[PDB]
Design a protein around this nucleic acid. Structure first.
Ligand SMILES: [Mg+2]
Ligand SMILES: [Zn+2]
Ligand SMILES: [Zn+2]
Lengths: 1415, 87, 131, 107
RNA sequence: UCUCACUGGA
């Protein structure tokens, strides 16, 4: 790029400044005299109309006159026109701002309406924030609508401070499209607002007016907010299109401009000549409408101006609004060169960093490398071979950017390569490239692998890198990007290759492992029966590509050399390993060979399965990568792959219907088991017929029957499945694949053998699409499971067509859910990316945005990386008091806490010494304060926690290196142990400033890890069980320091984008008491909007008593919402004309009871027996409640509860009483509370667990009561006595913030989001969601994850604009004229520099002195 | 201004390197190497400029200065040599 | 056969397994303006310009329907002047190659001399193909 | 300290911006019946003095604007009596690092 | 010479 190199100084961008034109500035810029509405080709000849395109504007190829800026089509930016708008027209998007600024000004003067005479205007002018400041001034200047000349100041009312006069009234203007009607308002004075009048008013609005209105008189001029000279883009913006001759097909913006210039001639000829003062008003509106519909055509002037032949318009808001729009299509990732796309295929003979490229791509994918003396012979040999082979050359780019095009000329073996040229050689081996599959979803979604050129055009990959790509071999497609510069190759090769990626940041696990065929093969292989002959041991030992040439000793040599093939697997596993699992009863004498034990590459015992060689938490690949590094891991994969490959090729593994059919009598047992299941459903149906079903609270009788049917059905299904699975024997191959874990599950074998089970649609079982029945083959009103959707036989025996239709529904439901969830998870993905795009971590380990706003002080509160964090256990947090004291307590001045001299060689002379006893009791009290601290942190007390480098692994590594013999006591000095503990405790530098803020930050950050380290390297541990030496201890502490300061977080990771992708992956895997989860939950939380579809909450009981049922009944009754509709059937108005004796005989006694002043209107309310036993409500309580809630015009009268009708007679206490009394008794029935607060719906009395520490030392899973409910009013349900309001919980984060403060709202947001994601079963790391939840709660409220919040924050314009709001926010930042700092990722994507992050987050400068030094 | 250079005490950054800094250093020295620079250590018969740069940075022998941009717009300088390439 | 991919006896592919012909057809038009102006199908030359070799053309710019076609051959010769001779032939398909099979020389309701080409192409089941 | 039982007139609140510096509070009895810092999701808040604010902003190369914020009408902010410009330390428990400091300006 | 429409695959 850029032939004819010149002398302009070169830089990169720092300023992005917006603002509006002057018309005089356009007259300064342009070189145009535009009047010809006829466009181009003067008298239809290949020549130049000088009115439109080329009045020395841009021309096209082979006709170069472009005011000496010829350059062909390329190398010449076009230049701008202009328009002589006689009548001034509006600017269409700015009209909302025009209304909102004409509410602030007295007309025809320009003065502000409301000034610092107003105290609120004074206080509101202190906002140094332009947009919200103008918003507040607009809210203040919508108040009063008349220019007040003599104004009383904020001192006293009787004196009248003057200002500019002209006390005219501001008319109320309401918008009508291109028309703003000024109706002055006595005397409705509707006046069409002159553009020339408001022109003059804005030309008179002044300096302090603009700047106190948040606008810039240097740049942002609301009198420049009116179009009166419009510049015209060049033909290098609007091109032309031919039909091999210019007959048809020019451009739409060209014809828009010809249209508006024709409308300009229409406004011209009626002002140049006669003036129709009711028809020259439309001489403008044509021109105004056309220049307005140019820039925007979604206006409230609903005539679209649909252009000819059915194509409506081609406008610029439609050009700029994204998704095939201009910004989002050409600016944030486009179609590229140096590209390759094909189908994929597999092979295991290749390796993990290898991809098999076709030879004919290698003949056309190429690389322009410079002429180098280091292989000038081979490069000249490539250009001597020629472009028509594999090892050839395509171009020879010369020294000044000149491509030698080889083959089409006559000398394909031409010139020796001059130094300074670039030979464009083709692809050769071991240039690793980028290789991605769309959709891209995480860090691992792209990787790099070396090239191994092959025939038969596919793209290879190794079969255990096809797992994290989420590809498969159904012809799913992957792309190929070849990096181009030398440093680009270096960057991709040193970062983006697969062994660097292996441990995954997603949920801190390995993302790869071993997959189906290799996996089941290694599952059969490491069985003990796999005895191997001699020459096959020879063949596999050559097959390992890095054999040591050592024929191993045969474990069986009795007569004959045999091998238990675990041992010949062990020659693949390299040195320095340990693992141990202890599955159920694996104590060193396994009757099952399940578990593991490895030493240095000797499998001691145990099968190899997915929880060793796959993706597992205690992964063997994980331990290999931590103990060695990536290239040793990469060779591990090759060894295990090709070893199990050869053993599978010459053993074989098949499957078939023999793996499906169970034995005969057990299939008979299966069928009678489902028969007893239908016996159970038959008994509970016949109990439903008698209607005696005790419906527990939460559901009615029918759904309380339904949950019992579904539960008994699926319980019977899985019991019969277990019966089948333990029927089957070892030679069941699909059972062997199940214990492999390649595909399938116990549910899969259960489906294929015992029974299919239960179809479903949308959570329910099958409901009647007809009336009363699902199928015409069924009776009407059937709640047998056979019509409600049970299926009787498994896939073996078949499908009756009713079952086939049920199952067709149950599958088409799943196709519904994929065909909607791909769309909504794709939108939620792109929203989260464009939200958290720029959050990196800077050098002082603090987390910043594009605008320097600090987001997290230490990333993840420690600077510990998801590329490193493992899971280790605690030891302190459990244990009894006496057991823990026996465990760690050391004293010589006691009976049993002594040591044994078989550990310490100097154990005799150590006795009784207080000079060490003070140190020992220091350490023990340190760890007991630590124990209290841990039980302050973690309430439950589980022990596996995401922490950095494994202490337990590192001491056992020192054991298996330095040969601890457990008979000689050790030479370790106890003072040296304590001193090394202290010195390494003061050694873990994450923060490196020497003052008290930094030191408190460092100590408070790594507090918990240092607690763990001292709990582990305590004295009795390192003596009794790890039993180290002096050299072992020193090497252990050296290793802890070394790998901890290796595993501290580096600066430069785009932790925001990587966090967004790592929470955006496991949302894809989601599917669908009845409280929701899934993509509706995620969308309800990120789009924080108030109408949440299940706002539930939870209370606990009083902290005094444990599980008291009567008191829990009291709390739920006292909270439980109770209205009069809930308690009534018959609300009756009678007219009993005797208000001292009831004409109905039921109520003789009651008035003379009451009299132991009225109306003849008997007002009767029935209560039912069901409701006043549903709540513990007394009739006297209810009557006194009616009393104390009305108290005005009613005589309360009860009835008897012991008599079985509950009647509330009333009359009226002092005739046209019923006409208003019917609305009154409505308001009784459904507008008066009786118990609790509102929004207390279905209240569920649950008896959960309580995982508490014991009052004796241990842990206790305790019973108590915890209520469940599905309402929200947190302030009012909180204040009720009888609960545990310090431990209340709601999901409704809006009310949680507004009730309990923003930081507790953030923390509850976090627990909510984490638990509703990990309810699926998947996992993610803490820190990615931590960064996300903090950017949610940083701006002060809860910023919604949409265009309502963060994309309406005060951040940079061009970073903000690329989420489909292009015209709005671009015209906004042109109105306020903002300075964008160019400190943003998307900004440098748009403007083409290095992104100012990561490997763009520093400089590189050449030294002068070390150049002299190193020679 | 350039009133923004901390001297070589109280440098709050690391005495290590990072992967990204390592990547840019390796690439930049490789760009010089493939752009016909004087090498500083002997070839091992090696025309592989990534491997050449890794040989050079085995022993702190690459003549460059890093500018760690401090998080306010200021910066520190850094010799390549005083880092610890432990990884 | 990791991840469902299947493995193929190449010898039966020689014996005929999944062997297949393929039939695409073309079009070309001597176009019609509004002023009754007819165009021409004849053997074009240099008198939008290509550089495809005229080696398999006919008298009237056609191709005989039984010859192997390859590379970037000019498919249908076409010329049109305005009152010059343009390069209105259409070159070959960049994505496929084969044998021209069947040529008919027809017209429409209003007399546009209309010639067509169907192509036959053998295709053998190669490795990167989906079954 | 001024505590209403149920209501205070909004037009009565036009007497509030009256004098520097003595400030009148406004509190619901019912909302303060239980503590809004006793809740186990509420982290403990601790004040800062202005010279230590100068200390902090010189340590972190920061200003007033670059900080994580809060609104003045925040419930525990009105529990603490926080006015415009301050800095409040927040020390919260966690999982992967035990303890961690948090700083909020009060705009 | 491409704009749009509708199919097709993942
Ligand atoms: Mg697929
Ligand atoms: Zn020019
Ligand atoms: Zn005025």
């Amino acid at each position: 790029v850029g032939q004819q190199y010149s002398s302009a100084p070169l830089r990169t961008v720092k300023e992005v400044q917006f603002g509006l034109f002057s018309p005089e500035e356009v007259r300064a810029i342009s070189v145009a005299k535009i009047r010809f509405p006829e466009t181009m080709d003067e008298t239809q000849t290949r020549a130049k109309i000088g009115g439109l395109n080329d009045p020395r504007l841009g021309s096209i190829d082979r006709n170069l006159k472009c005011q000496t800026c010829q350059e062909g089509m390329n190398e010449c930016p076009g230049h701008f026109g202009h328009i002589d708008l006689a009548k001034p027209v509006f600017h269409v998007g700015f009209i909302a701002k025009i209304k909102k600024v004409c509410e602030c000004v007295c007309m025809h003067c320009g003065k502000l309406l409301l000034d610092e005479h107003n105290e609120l205007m004074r206080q509101a002018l202190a906002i140094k924030d332009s947009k919200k400041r103008f918003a507040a001034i607009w809210t203040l200047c919508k108040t009063k609508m008349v220019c007040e000349t003599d104004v009383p100041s904020e001192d006293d009312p009787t004196q009248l401070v003057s200002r500019g006069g002209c006390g005219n009234t501001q008319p109320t203007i309401r918008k009508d499209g291109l028309k703003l009607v000024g109706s002055w308002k006595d005397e409705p004075e509707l006046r069409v607002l002159s553009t020339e009048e408001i022109l003059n008013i804005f030309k008179h609005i002044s300096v302090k007016d603009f700047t106190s209105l948040g606008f810039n008189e240097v740049f942002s001029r609301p009198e420049w907010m009116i179009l009166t000279c419009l510049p015209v883009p060049p033909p290098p913006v609007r091109p032309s299109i031919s039909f091999n001759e210019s007959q048809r097909g020019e451009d739409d913006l060209t014809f828009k401009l010809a249209d508006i210039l024709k409308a300009n001639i229409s406004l011209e000829t009626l002002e140049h000549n006669g003036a129709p003062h009711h028809a020259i008003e439309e001489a403008e509106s044509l021109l105004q409408f056309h220049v307005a519909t140019y820039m925007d055509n979604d206006i409230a002037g609903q005539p679209q101006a649909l252009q000819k032949s059915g194509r409506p318009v081609k406008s610029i808001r439609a050009r700029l609004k994204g998704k095939e729009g201009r910004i989002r299509g050409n600016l944030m990732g486009k179609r590229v060169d140096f590209s390759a796309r094909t189908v994929i295929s597999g092979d295991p003979n290749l390796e993990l960093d290898q991809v098999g490229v076709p030879k004919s791509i290698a003949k056309t994918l190429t690389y322009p490398e410079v002429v180098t003396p280091y292989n000038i012979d081979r490069l000249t040999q490539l250009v001597r071979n020629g472009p028509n082979e594999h090892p050839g050359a395509k171009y020879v780019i010369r020294d000044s950017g000149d491509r030698i095009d080889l083959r089409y000329s006559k000398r394909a073996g031409d010139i020796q390569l001059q130094y300074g040229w670039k030979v464009e050689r083709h692809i050769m081996d071991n240039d690793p490239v980028l290789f991605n599959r769309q959709p891209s979803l995480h860090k691992m979604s792209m990787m790099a692998h070396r090239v191994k050129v092959i025939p038969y055009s596919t793209f290879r990959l190794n079969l255990s890198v096809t797992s994290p790509y989420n590809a498969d071999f159904d012809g799913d497609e992957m792309n190929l990007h070849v990096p181009q510069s030398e440093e680009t190759r270096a960057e991709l090769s040193q970062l983006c290759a697969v062994p660097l990626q292996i441990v995954s940041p997603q949920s801190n696990k390995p993302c790869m492992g071993i997959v189906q065929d290799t996996l089941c093969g290694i599952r059969k292989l490491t069985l003990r029966d796999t005895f191997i002959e001699l020459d096959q041991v020879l063949n596999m030992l050559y097959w390992v590509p890095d054999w040591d040439g050592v024929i191993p000793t045969p474990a069986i040599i009795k007569p004959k050399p045999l091998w238990s093939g675990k041992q010949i697997l062990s020659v693949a596993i390299p040195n320095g390993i340990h693992l141990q699992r202890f599955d159920e009863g694996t104590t060193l004498l396994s009757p099952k060979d399940n578990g593991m034990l490895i030493i240095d590459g000797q499998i001691i015992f145990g099968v190899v399965e997915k929880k060793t060689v796959g993706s597992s938490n205690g992964g063997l690949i994980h331990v290999v990568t931590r103990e060695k590094g990536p290239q040793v891991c990469a060779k591990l994969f090759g060894n295990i792959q090709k070893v199990v490959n050869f053993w599978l090729l010459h053993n074989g593994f098949s499957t078939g219907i023999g793996d499906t059919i169970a034995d005969g009598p057990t299939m008979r047992e299966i069928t009678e088991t489902i028969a007893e299941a239908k016996k159970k459903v038959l008994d509970v149906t016949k109990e439903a017929q008698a209607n005696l079903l005790t419906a527990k609270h939460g559901m009615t009788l029918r759904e309380s029957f339904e949950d019992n049917v579904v539960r008994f059905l699926n319980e019977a299904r899985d019991k019969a499945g277990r019966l089948a699975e333990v029927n089957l024997k070892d030679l069941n191959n699909v059972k062997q694949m199940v214990m492999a874990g390649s595909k399938g599950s116990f549910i899969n074998i259960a489906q294929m053998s015992a029974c299919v089970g239960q179809q479903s649609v949308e959570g329910k079982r099958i409901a009647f699409g007809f009336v009363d029945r699902t199928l015409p083959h069924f009776s009407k009103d059937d709640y047998s499971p056979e019509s409600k959707g049970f299926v009787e036989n498994s896939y073996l025996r078949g499908l009756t067509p009713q079952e086939f239709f049920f199952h067709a529904m149950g599958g088409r439901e799943g196709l519904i859910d994929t065909a909607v969830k791909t769309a909504e998870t794709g939108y939620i993905q792109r929203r989260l990316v464009k939200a958290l795009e720029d959050i990196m971590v800077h050098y002082d380990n603090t987390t910043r945005n594009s605008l320097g706003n600090v987001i997290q002080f230490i990333y993840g509160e420690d600077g510990m990386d998801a590329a490193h964090i493992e899971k280790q256990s605690l030891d302190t947090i459990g244990g009894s008091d006496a057991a823990f004291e026996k465990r760690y307590r050391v004293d010589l001045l006691n009976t049993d806490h002594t040591l044994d001299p078989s550990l310490l060689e100097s154990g005799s002379e150590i006795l009784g010494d207080l000079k060490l006893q003070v140190l020992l009791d220091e350490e023990y009290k340190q760890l007991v304060k630590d124990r209290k601290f841990l039980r302050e942190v973690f309430v439950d007390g589980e022990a596996n926690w995401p922490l950095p480098v494994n202490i337990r692994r590192i001491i056992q590594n020192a054991q298996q290196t330095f040969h601890i013999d457990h008979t000689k006591p050790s030479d370790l000095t106890i003072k040296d142990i304590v001193l090394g503990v202290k010195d390494l405790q003061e050694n873990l530098l994450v923060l490196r400033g020497k003052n008290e803020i930094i030191q408190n930050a460092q100590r408070d950050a790594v507090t918990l890890f240092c607690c763990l380290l001292r709990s582990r390297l305590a004295t009795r541990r390192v003596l009794q069980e790890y039993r180290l030496t002096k050299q072992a201890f020193d090497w252990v502490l050296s290793n802890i320091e070394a790998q901890f300061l290796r595993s501290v977080v580096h600066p430069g990771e785009m932790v925001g984008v990587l966090a967004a992708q790592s929470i955006g992956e496991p949302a894809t895997q989601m599917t669908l008491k009845k409280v929701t989860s899934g993509v509706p939950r995620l969308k309800e939380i990120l789009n924080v909007a108030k109408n949440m579809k299940t706002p539930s909450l939870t209370v606990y009981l009083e902290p005094g008593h444990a599980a008291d049922q009567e008191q829990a009944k009291l709390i739920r009754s006292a909270i439980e919402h109770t209205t009069l509709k809930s308690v009534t059937i018959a609300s009756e108005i009678y007219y009993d004309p005797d208000p001292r004796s009831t004409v109905i005989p039921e109520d003789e006694e009651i008035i003379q009871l009451h009299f132991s002043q009225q109306s003849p209107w008997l007002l009767r309310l029935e209560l039912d027996r069901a409701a006043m036993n549903d709540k513990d409500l007394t009739m006297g309580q209810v009557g006194e409640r009616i009393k104390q809630t009305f108290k005005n015009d009613l005589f309360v009268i009860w009835s008897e509860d012991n008599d079985e009708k509950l009647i509330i007679r009333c009359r009226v206490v002092r005739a046209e009483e019923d006409h208003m009394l019917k609305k009154i008794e409505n308001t009784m029935l459904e507008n008066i509370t009786l118990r609790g607060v509102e929004n207390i719906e279905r209240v569920v009395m649950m008896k959960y667990d309580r995982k508490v520490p014991s009052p004796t030392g241990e842990y206790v899973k305790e019973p108590e009561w915890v209520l469940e409910t599905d309402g929200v009013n947190l302030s009012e349900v909180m204040t009720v006595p009888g609960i545990d309001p310090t431990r209340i919980y709601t999901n409704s984060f809006i009310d949680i913030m507004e009730v309990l403060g923003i930081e507790a709202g953030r923390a509850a947001l976090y627990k909510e989001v984490y638990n509703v994601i990990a309810s699926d079963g998947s996992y993610v790391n803490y820190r990615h969601m931590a960064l996300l939840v903090d950017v949610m709660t940083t701006q002060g409220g809860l910023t919604s994850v949409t265009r309502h919040g963060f994309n309406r924050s005060n951040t940079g314009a061009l970073m903000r604009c690329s989420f489909e709001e292009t015209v709005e926010i671009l015209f906004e930042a042109g109105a306020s004229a903002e300075l964008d700092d160019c400190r943003g990722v998307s900004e440098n994507v748009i403007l083409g520099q290095m992104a100012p992050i990561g490997t763009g987050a520093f400089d590189v400068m050449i030294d002068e002195e070390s150049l002299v030094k190193y020679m | 201004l350039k009133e923004k250079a901390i001297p070589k005490d109280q440098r709050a950054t690391t005495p290590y390197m990072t992967k990204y800094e390592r990547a840019r250093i390796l690439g930049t020295r490789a760009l010089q190497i493939s752009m016909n620079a004087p090498v500083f250590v002997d070839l091992e018969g090696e025309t592989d400029p990534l491997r050449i740069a890794m040989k050079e940075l085995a022993e702190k022998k690459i003549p460059l200065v890093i500018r760690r941009y401090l998080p306010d717009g200021s910066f520190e300088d850094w010799s390549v040599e005083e880092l610890i390439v432990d990884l | 056969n990791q991840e469902d991919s299947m493995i193929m006896n190449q010898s039966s592919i020689d014996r005929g397994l999944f062997r297949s012909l393929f039939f695409r057809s073309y079009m070309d038009q001597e176009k019609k303006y509004g002023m009754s102006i007819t165009e021409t199908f004849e053997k074009p030359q240099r008198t939008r310009m290509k550089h495809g070799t005229y080696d398999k053309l006919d008298d009237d710019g056609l191709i005989a329907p039984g010859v192997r076609v390859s590379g970037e051959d000019v498919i249908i010769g076409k010329t049109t002047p305005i009152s010059s001779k343009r390069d209105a032939s259409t070159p070959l398909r960049s994505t496929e190659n084969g044998i021209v099979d069947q040529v008919l020389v027809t017209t429409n309701q209003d007399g546009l001399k209309f010639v067509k080409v169907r192509v036959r192409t053998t295709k053998i089941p190669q490795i990167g193909d989906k079954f | 300290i001024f505590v209403y039982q149920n209501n205070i007139t909004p037009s009565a609140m036009k007497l509030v911006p009256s004098i520097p510096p003595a400030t009148i509070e406004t509190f619901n009895e019912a909302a303060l019946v239980v503590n809004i810092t006793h809740h186990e999701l509420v982290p403990k808040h601790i004040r800062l003095s202005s010279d230590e604010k100068r200390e902090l902003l010189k340590r972190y190369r920061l200003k007033e604007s670059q900080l994580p914020r809060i609104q003045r009408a925040d419930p525990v902010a009105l529990y603490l009596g926080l006015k415009r410009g301050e800095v409040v330390k927040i020390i919260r428990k966690s999982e992967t690092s035990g303890r961690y400091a948090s700083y909020r300006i009060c705009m």
